[PDB]
Structures are given as C-alpha cells and as structure tokens.
Amino acid sequence: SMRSTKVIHIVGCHAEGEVGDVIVGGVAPPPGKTVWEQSRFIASDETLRNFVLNEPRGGVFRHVNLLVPPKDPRAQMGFIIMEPADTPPMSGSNSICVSTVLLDSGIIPMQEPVTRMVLEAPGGLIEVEAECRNGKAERISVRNVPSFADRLNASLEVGTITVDTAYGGDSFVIVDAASIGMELAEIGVKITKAANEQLGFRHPEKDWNHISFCQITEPVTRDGDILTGVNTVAITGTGCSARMAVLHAKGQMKVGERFIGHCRLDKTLELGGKPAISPIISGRAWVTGTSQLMLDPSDPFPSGY
Amino acid sequence: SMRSTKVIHIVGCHAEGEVGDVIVGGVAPPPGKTVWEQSRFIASDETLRNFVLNEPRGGVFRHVNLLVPPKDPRAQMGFIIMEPADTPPMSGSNSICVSTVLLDSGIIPMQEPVTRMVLEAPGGLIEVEAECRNGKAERISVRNVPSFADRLNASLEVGTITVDTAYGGDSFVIVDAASIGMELAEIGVKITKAANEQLGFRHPEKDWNHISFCQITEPVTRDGDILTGVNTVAITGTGCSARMAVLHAKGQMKVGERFIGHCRLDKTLELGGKPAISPIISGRAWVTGTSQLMLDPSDPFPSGY
C-alpha cells in the first residue's frame, strides 16, 4: 500500500528547452489579497517550492508555475513562478509555458489563427497572443511588464569596474565581460553581492528591492533591425528584457527592433517618472506529460533535498 | 489540444535519497531472449533512456527502472536499470526502489511482517526480503549478485600508483585517497581511463568487459562487527558491494560483518574459479508519485537534452 499527505496535479511543459511545469490542481490559492502577496507567501513559506523543485521530484533546472485565480478582473488566470533561485515578479519562458499549458490542455479555449489572453503574474498583467494551428498553440508572444534601466555606468568596487542595473521581470546587474574577462559564475556572484551593497535596487511601483543576478555580456552585433548578443547569468526572457532596457537607454537599440540572446522592443513607456520599455518575448513550448506528486507520511525528506 | 507519440506510466520512488523511478506501463519489453540482452538493447538504442533520463522530463540525478516480464521462471518480475552513466547489471538503490514500487503499489501481494520475492535483474536473479508493516514495505534487503575483486594491488601508470579492481553489480577501479590526495572527479576519470587501458576487466560469467567508474576511498574504521568507510565515485550499493569484496579479499572484513558507506557480507562463494562474496544491501524507499510522460510530435527535442 501507498500513502500520501497530498496530491499535486501537474502538466509538464518546456519552452525552447527551458522547463516550466504547471500545477493545475491540488493546491489551494495561497493567502493574500493580491497575486503579488500570494507569491510572497510562496517565497517565504517554501513548502510548495521545496516539494516541487527539489529532488526527488524536481531537479536543479526545474521551474514550476502555480495557477491561481486572477485577482485583477481583466485577467483570465493568475500564476506564481517558482524558479530554483527565486520567486520572481515575471519570467519570459515560464509565462510562455503557462500560456501553452492553458491553451494546449484546453483550460482556456483556442481560436485560430490567433488566441489572445490576459494573464496576471505577480509583477502585473501580461498580454498574450498565441499563434494557434490545428489545435496547437505553436508560438506564444508575451508583452512583459514594464522594464527599465535603474543605473547606467555606475562605478562599483569589487578591480574597480563599471556596471548597469536593470529590471525586466527580475533584477540584474549587467557587466561587459572584456572589461573584466571573457570562473564567470564566481565573479558574477561577488559583483551581484557588491551591487546590492553599494547601489541597491528599488522598483518604483513594486516591492522588489534587491538585485537578484549578474548578467555578463559581450557586445551586440547588428544585422538590420535584429541585434544579437552573447550573455550568461551567474546565480533568458527577463534577462533579455532587462538588457534591451539598457541597450535602449544607451541608444544602441531603437523601438521596433528585435533582440536575440525572440525579444522585441515594442514601445516606450514611463514608469516612476523615468523611461521604460515594453518588451514582447516570444517562443514555442510543448507539453511533456502529466503527473500526480505525492508524499508518504514516513518519508524523512518531506522538503526533498 | 495536445498530442503525444507515446505515453509512459511511471511510479516515482527514491531509496534513502537516491531516485529510482519505475516504469510500470506503456513500454513493451525490449527485444532479446534474456533480460541481459534486453538491457543491452536499452543501452545501445538509447531512445527510452534519453526520453526518461534527460531534461525536460528527467534530470542529471534521475535513475529509471523498466519493469519487464521475468525470463527466468524462478523470478516474479524482471527489471532493467537505467542510470545516467550506464545501464548496469545491478544496482542496490534501484533494486530497492523496484522492490518498493512492486509491493507498495500492489503489483506483488504483501505479507507481513515479511514478504519474500525473487527478481531478475540484467546481471542475474536477486533475492529480496521486505519488512512490511501496516501496508508499507518499510525496509528492503536485497541479496546482490555475486561480487568479487578482479585485481588487488595492481600497479597502474597515471605519478605511479596502486589500485584494486572489483565488481559488485557494476565495475570499479578503487584507490586510496591519501596514496594520492584527499579535482577528485578529475583525477578519478583519468584513473578509470588508465585502468581500462592497462588492466581491463572481464566478468567470468557475464559480458561486462570494462571498468565503469573509479571509487576513491579513505581507510575504514571498525566498531565491533560494523565497518564504516568514507568514499566517493568519479563519473552506493554496487560501490559498497565491490568495496566489501576487496576488503574481504585483503582480510579487513569477515563473513557476517556489516559495512556502512547498510551492506552485509552474508557469505562467500566461488565465481569463475575464484572467491566472491554474497552481499546483502538494505535500505528504505518511498513512492513519490505517478506520472504519464508524453512527447509532442513537433517537439524538436524528442531525445531531450
């Protein structure tokens, strides 16, 4: 015989090779008056995160998204993103997976050639356009939350270097590799540490008040209205949104252009009192299965490992 | 809508913190006249392995076991072990998971306080005794396949060092750390490489003719009839079985004693023409859920990544 203290129902999914599994049942919505507050519970409490992210049920590269009811009536569904490192306001790949699961598994009805949805992420509403064909949500385009550069060309003591800070659904300190090197993971974290110490970060209308990661980049190359940039992140759709905000701020990217790390700088906005951009992130996703997660009452690793 | 080219039904499971998920349906038994030949198909063909082991469905630490019909009539069930690195003749933790899934999910009936089963692994029959209480297979004890040392104190050029080689369901070159160091993963693989080059390995009655891994150890400590030994493996129940075979060969472990890396040296045997031991490996396991794995026909990563 088996025993389980809970049963969590998941539709597995990945977007362009990034896992973004989706909890569709078995989890009541977290306490909180807003989707933001609900995500803060999930981040603080950690029970759901550890259970679905850690071995023996998850893995270091797993991301999991929890569907919850929309709090903003303009939205059809809310979701909370659980990544390995944090529980962020938004995530490109995960919003693509959530959209794909909602449409491919029939939770939201599908129109062809295009289905439009409004979803509510912790960081605000996102507009989704899905290209749908023969029953499949083939490609999802998401208008990400307002994204922006916080500091440009800020000096930071680590050598002594220059960095940008930016937000595109999560927060980054962004550094050119050559200005230091071309190991990276190790340097990346000290830089993030230092940036939090000396620059900080505060989102104008959301309570995200730290820098999560460091993005290390090499110079973009331009081909017409497409920019291509090599980068890595020391501990990506929020990465690209944040980087696009910096490139735009420094004049190296204009409205209407695309960035490939697809991302598109759709328009400018004002946020706080300062310039921001509206990024559109797009990608394809595929359902990878269904699962029912369980926990034996005698399992000595209730939070996994 | 969703599409899938296949549906594979799994009962998830871990033994003492090692994942050993079990395929219970959706996969026909592989071609082959023996469970050994079927495992060789699985190793060569790789389709099933890549599909269940790789992201986005698996992860680097996942092991998966495929139930198949017994070919030897003395067995109640056969199984093929799929680890990240290889498809081995036997595995302690995986045989414990297979036993636990068979009993806890009701495939084989449970008697209390003890259920006995005979299973067929690729490397031969294993005898299983499960301590069962209130419906739960609490602890499994497995008589592993005959295990043995192949070479003792063999010289190997790498510095110039001394090693033992041994088999306990998989094959190991075993080296004392201090005799080199106390990085390890990197040295481990060259040592394995060198051992394959200069010593080789050939199992007397099975077609396992190479050394899979290097085990790096520190000296055992003894407390009564319990030996405790620190070790690591550069790329564990087969590890402990192999190590016990060497300790026994060198006189540092006697019949009836236990080794904690639980393992027990139950008795001696002859294999080929040379001494071997019969290890009993024991541990607890817990079911972690059920899943139905799927593959969209348009997913460009049919073998995962």
Curated annotation (Swiss-Prot), chains A, B:
Binding annotation for substrate: G92, S93, G237, T238
The keyword 4Fe-4S appears for this protein: no
Annotated family: Belongs to the proline racemase family.
Active site, renumbered: S91 (proton acceptor)
Top-level taxon of origin: Bacteria
Entry protein name: 4-hydroxyproline 2-epimerase 1
Gene Ontology molecular function: 4-hydroxyproline epimerase activity; trans-L-3-hydroxyproline dehydratase activity
Function comment: Catalyzes the epimerization of trans-4-hydroxy-L-proline (t4LHyp) to cis-4-hydroxy-D-proline (c4DHyp) in vitro, albeit with low efficiency. The physiological substrate may be different. Displays no proline racemase activity.
SUPFAM superfamilies linked: Diaminopimelate epimerase-like
Reactions the enzyme catalyzes: trans-4-hydroxy-L-proline = cis-4-hydroxy-D-proline
Enzyme Commission (EC) number: 5.1.1.8
Enzyme class: isomerase
Matching PANTHER family: BIFUNCTIONAL TRANS-3-HYDROXY-L-PROLINE DEHYDRATASE_2-EPIMERASE, TRANS-3-HYDROXY-L-PROLINE DEHYDRATASE
Alphabetized UniProt keyword annotations: Isomerase
InterPro entries assigned: Pro_racemase_fam
Organism: Brucella anthropi (strain ATCC 49188 / DSM 6882 / CCUG 24695 / JCM 21032 / LMG 3331 / NBRC 15819 / NCTC 12168 / Alc 37)
Transmembrane segments: none
